[PDB]
């Protein structure tokens, strides 16, 4: 199947599969069952910010999610990506809804990757920044229900003409070009992704979340990965 690594912003508690009983952010390594989580005071209707960072020196993946003039939620995990991901991967954003829904709007997204090879200051780097998405974003691969264009935002899951989120929806957006994430002799390898999201829900509790992910190049949405599976995993193992 696919090799996935993701930082999820889980809005709905699925205790039946490991989710702590409250909204949270977590780090998933090839499984929707987070290796580590942290409480997250999600705020319906407010624009938030997510910051993911990683460096080959510490081999520690960390994430920060916060809202203006509010507290932050943090989560870290020691992991050696060399032994988890292939050296060439694709990066993207994923989201979904199930019985309950929410809007999974991305207002901006940026990514930076640097690979310092073992040679007198020989760095390879990639950097892209999206502050507004157009109707025809050719440098992005949209999968599932993902669409771009309205208000210049990226709507990961289905939204009605009036603006109401729809249930049972999956969507993903991957940056077109492959990303050289690691190398056998890289003195230092690191990357940092950032994105602002706006999650709104009309019904009671919202679901199911947004996730930043790294996968094999030819990855695609698994069948039935709506709802609790965040469009990332085929099953809950």
């Amino acid at each position: 199947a696919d090799t996935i690594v993701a930082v999820e912003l889980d809005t709905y508690p699925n205790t039946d599969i490991g989710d702590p009983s409250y909204p949270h952010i977590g780090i998933d390594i090839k499984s929707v069952r987070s290796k580590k989580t942290a409480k997250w005071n999600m705020q319906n209707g407010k624009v938030g910010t997510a910051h993911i960072i990683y460096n080959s020196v510490d081999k520690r993946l960390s994430a920060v999610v916060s809202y203006p003039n509010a507290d932050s939620a943090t989560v870290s995990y020691d992991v050696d990506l060399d032994n988890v991901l292939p050296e060439w991967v694709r990066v993207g954003l994923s989201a979904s809804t199930g019985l309950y829904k929410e809007t999974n709007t991305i207002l901006s997204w940026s990514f930076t990757s640097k690979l310092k090879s073992n040679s007198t200051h020989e760095t390879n780097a990639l950097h892209f920044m999206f502050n507004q998405f157009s109707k025809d974003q050719k440098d992005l691969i949209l999968q599932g229900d993902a669409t771009t264009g309205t208000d210049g935002n990226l709507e990961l899951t289905r939204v009605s003409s009036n603006g109401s989120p729809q249930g049972s929806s999956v969507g993903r957006a991957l940056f077109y070009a492959p990303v050289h994430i690691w190398e056998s002799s890289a003195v230092v390898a690191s990357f940092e992704a950032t994105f602002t999201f706006l999650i709104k829900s009309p019904d009671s509790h919202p679901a199911d979340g947004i996730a930043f992910f790294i996968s094999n190049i030819d990855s695609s949405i698994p069948s039935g990965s709506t709802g609790r599976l965040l469009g990332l995993f085929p099953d809950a193992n």
Binding site: Q43, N44, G45, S204
Partner: peptide, 10 residues
């Protein structure tokens, strides 16, 4: 801020 579950900053 249309509204939101277990919420509100100050």
């Amino acid at each position: 801020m249309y509204w939101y579950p277990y919420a509100s900053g100050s």
